[PDB]
Design an enzyme around this catalytic site. Structure first.
Site, PDB file in Angstrom:
ATOM      1  CG  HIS A 123      88.602 -84.419  97.360  1.00 19.83           C
ATOM      2  ND1 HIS A 123      88.787 -83.984  98.484  1.00 19.83           N
ATOM      3  CD2 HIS A 123      88.808 -83.430  96.643  1.00 19.83           C
ATOM      4  CE1 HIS A 123      89.519 -82.914  98.561  1.00 19.83           C
ATOM      5  NE2 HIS A 123      89.467 -82.439  97.385  1.00 19.83           N
ATOM      6  CD  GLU A 136      76.763 -76.813  84.886  1.00 22.51           C
ATOM      7  OE1 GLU A 136      76.577 -77.846  84.673  1.00 22.51           O
ATOM      8  OE2 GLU A 136      76.091 -75.830  84.326  1.00 22.51           O
ATOM      9  CG  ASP A 178      80.338 -74.604  92.760  1.00 19.55           C
ATOM     10  OD1 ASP A 178      80.682 -74.111  93.997  1.00 19.55           O
ATOM     11  OD2 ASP A 178      79.381 -74.855  92.553  1.00 19.55           O
ATOM     12  CD  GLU A 232      80.264 -70.704  91.026  1.00 17.61           C
ATOM     13  OE1 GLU A 232      80.513 -70.145  92.091  1.00 17.61           O
ATOM     14  OE2 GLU A 232      80.656 -71.907  90.848  1.00 17.61           O
TER      15      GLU A 232
END
Length: 688
Positions: A373, A99, A95, A8
């Site tokens: 997590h 998203e 990620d 990103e």
């Protein structure tokens, strides 16, 4: 053998390239590359024949989206396409939450690779973590992409249907925002509670008592106690009154005033008190869990005074530069290597006694393990100490150091031993003339700090309270022991209105109501302040008058849209889509057009958003919407705030020269908070 890797951001791209080495070209997408149309000119020629194309969603074809390349992203797409022509494989390293999965899916849809694709997922940027992710790609998770797209389309439809109502009935310059309006309602409702609050007075007696004459070893030899009973009637405290200053319908109390409290104290002069009860009870306090996004923003706000926006901006940098794990998480679980790293650091800094005897796992079950997590903790198999990191992050990077330190300290403290001490209670009896009085005192020791030597939470500045390591000492006393009175003070009190929210306590409420998510807490809180709904008075969030107008309009005529339970159920349903337990198309059809699914009386079960908003708006009168009733003046004339085109002003109708109703007005600034604009203040504004 060249590989293209897409992430990103440029900072993340340089950090990945540093660990992947030769043969990898790592480029940045600058976030999303596609979106729904933002204006008529975004609609390509092929779709100008579709009347739905500007809205960008074909609700009659299962909510089919029109994704277009944003004009400011065309050159990025063009460079990526050119680079792709010269590599043997494509790695997508966004990620792993919905998203980032949706960005990866868009890159695939846009770039249309003819070469193998590997989807890389990791939650810390370290050489071992990046190497592992590249060697063990994850299959693209279309349930995550569908959940992201459901929310994108929901936001577009919500804005399409609700914005025109806001424009016609409040002000043209407003934007719809569904979860934003709920957070604003939380703040407006608290302000309304403060405006309607009425204080009650109550008195007691504060005694300073000296036990040194009876037991010479009493430590401390003096202490404080408060009058709590008279002639078998409990004395009223602040918790015994309702929000209007009337006693609650509970056990009987006696409400003392100045006169009765002073007379009681006067009858105690020259007498001794007697210990009736004294209890010492041990407690053991467990360490705080490792940080998740909600508790990171709360503690950075209370302790470091960072806004939630600032905290997440800093955490993003610490993540992309390899210092901490991924900062959008609802997990407080630590990996076995991070438990061992924290336990070793605790032993080295505080000693064997301060390490928890067994390793501590805070395995709270996460709603979607695919997306995040692990707790927020320092990156790597061994954590860098703050002293080690203070040099790299000096100067302009001081915010990053301070937040890294907070995270390191929290993580080490989570593996340390319980704190121990004594909770202390004391019941003391005397006689004031013919009336038995009871005096009470409490106390708390900290005989063993445990984890509190490494981390203590900061109390909310508006709620107040005692910090977890605070101590209130009391001498050891025995039933029947006499005490002398040093000082007696009749003490007056008033009940207080409920506390305003800080950014910390609003995050806590968004989490407990089930309305916020790790990815949304800070964007909700930032957006309600930028669009003018909410401003800051010190650390307090205060609603603006237009926030009252908009919140009232939604509550009065579209109430399901700002209901806390309906909102939390929608957020839960989007999560079910992400988990593959609910279908994107089913959910959007039920929500938009109506259906028989979801909690009773929700928007879907009532007939859907389109029908809900498309009632007859002629009955909604814009003039009352922009009028906030405050109170009547002493003549019985209503005073209200009007939200005008040039901002808010106070208004009331008065007799003119002809005696007919005439508006009297006074302009208003946000210098006066809504609960401060009392009748007395209003008359002062009306005088000028």
């Amino acid at each position: 053998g060249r590989r293209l890797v897409i992430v990103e951001s440029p900072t993340k791209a340089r950090k990945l390239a540093s660990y992947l080495g030769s043969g990898y070209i790592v480029e940045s997408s600058r976030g999303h590359i596609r979106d729904l149309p933002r204006a008529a000119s975004d609609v390509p020629a092929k779709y100008k024949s579709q009347p739905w194309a500007r809205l960008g969603v074909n609700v009659d074809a299962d909510f089919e989206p029109l994704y277009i390349i944003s004009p400011e992203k065309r050159s990025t797409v063009s460079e990526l396409r050119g680079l792709l022509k010269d590599v043997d494989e494509l790695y997508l390293a966004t990620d792993g939450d919905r998203e980032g999965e949706a960005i990866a899916w868009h890159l695939l849809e846009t770039l249309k690779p003819r070469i193998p694709v590997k989807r890389m997922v990791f939650h810390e940027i370290t050489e071992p973590a990046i190497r592992a992710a590249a060697e063990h790609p994850r299959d693209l998770d279309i349930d995550l992409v569908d959940a992201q797209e459901t929310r994108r389309i929901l936001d577009r439809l919500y804005g399409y249907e609700v914005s025109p109502v806001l424009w016609k009935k409040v002000a043209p310059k407003l934007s719809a925002g569904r979860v934003q309006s709920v957070a604003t309602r939380i703040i407006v409702a608290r302000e309304r509670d403060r405006m309607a609050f009425r204080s009650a007075a109550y008195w007691d007696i504060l005694a300073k008592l000296d036990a040194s004459v009876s037991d010479p070893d009493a430590a401390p030899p003096t202490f404080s106690a408060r009058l709590t009973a008279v002639a078998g009637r409990r004395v009223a405290t602040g918790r015994d009154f309702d929000s209007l200053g009337t006693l609650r319908k509970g056990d009987e109390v006696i409400v003392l005033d100045e006169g009765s409290a002073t007379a009681l104290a006067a009858g105690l002069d020259g007498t001794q008190l007697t210990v009736a009860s004294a209890e010492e009870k041990p407690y053991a306090r467990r360490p705080y869990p490792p940080f998740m996004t909600s508790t990171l923003q709360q503690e950075a706000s209370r302790k470091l005074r960072f806004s939630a926006e600032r905290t997440m901006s800093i955490a993003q940098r610490l993540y992309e530069n390899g210092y901490i794990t991924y900062m959008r998480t609802d997990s407080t679980t630590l990996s076995e290597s991070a438990i061992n790293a924290a336990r070793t650091q605790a032993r080295q800094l505080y000693g064997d006694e301060y390490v928890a005897p067994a390793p501590r796992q805070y395995t709270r079950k996460v709603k979607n393990a695919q997306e995040a997590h692990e707790a927020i903790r320092p990156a790597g198999e061994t954590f860098a100490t703050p002293d080690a990191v203070r040099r790299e992050l000096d100067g302009p990077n001081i915010d990053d150091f301070r937040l890294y330190e907070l995270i390191w300290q929290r993580t080490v403290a989570s593996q340390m031993a319980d704190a121990r001490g004594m909770t202390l209670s004391l019941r003391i009896t005397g006689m004031s003339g013919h009336q038995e009085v009871v005096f009470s005192a409490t106390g708390r020791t900290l005989t063993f700090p445990g984890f509190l030597k490494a981390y203590v939470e900061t109390v909310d500045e508006l709620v107040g309270g005692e910090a977890d390591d605070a101590e209130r000492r009391l001498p050891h006393l025995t039933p029947g022991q006499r005490l002398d009175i040093v000082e007696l003070t009749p003490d007056g009190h008033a009940t207080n209105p409920p506390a305003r929210y800080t950014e910390a306590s609003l995050v806590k409420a968004l989490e407990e109501l089930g309305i916020g998510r790790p990815s949304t807490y800070s964007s909700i809180i930032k957006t309600i302040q930028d669009r003018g709904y909410v401003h800051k008075k010190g650390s307090a969030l205060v609603p603006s008058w237009v926030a009252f107008a908009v919140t009232g309009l939604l509550e009065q005529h579209f109430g399901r849209l700002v209901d806390y339970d309906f909102t939390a159920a929608m957020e839960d349903e989007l999560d079910e889509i992400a988990a593959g337990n609910e279908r994107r198309t089913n959910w959007l059809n039920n929500f938009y057009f109506g259906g028989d699914h979801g909690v009773p009386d929700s928007v879907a079960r009532s007939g859907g958003l389109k029908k809900l908003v498309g009632i007859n708006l002629e009955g909604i009168d814009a003039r009352e919407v922009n009028s906030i009733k405050l109170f009547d003046d002493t003549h019985g004339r209503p005073i209200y705030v009007r939200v005008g085109k040039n901002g808010p002003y106070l208004e009331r109708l008065v007799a003119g020269d002809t005696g007919e109703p005439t508006p009297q007005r006074a302009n208003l600034s946000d210098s006066i908070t809504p609960d401060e604009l009392t009748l007395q203040v209003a008359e002062e504004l009306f005088a000028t």
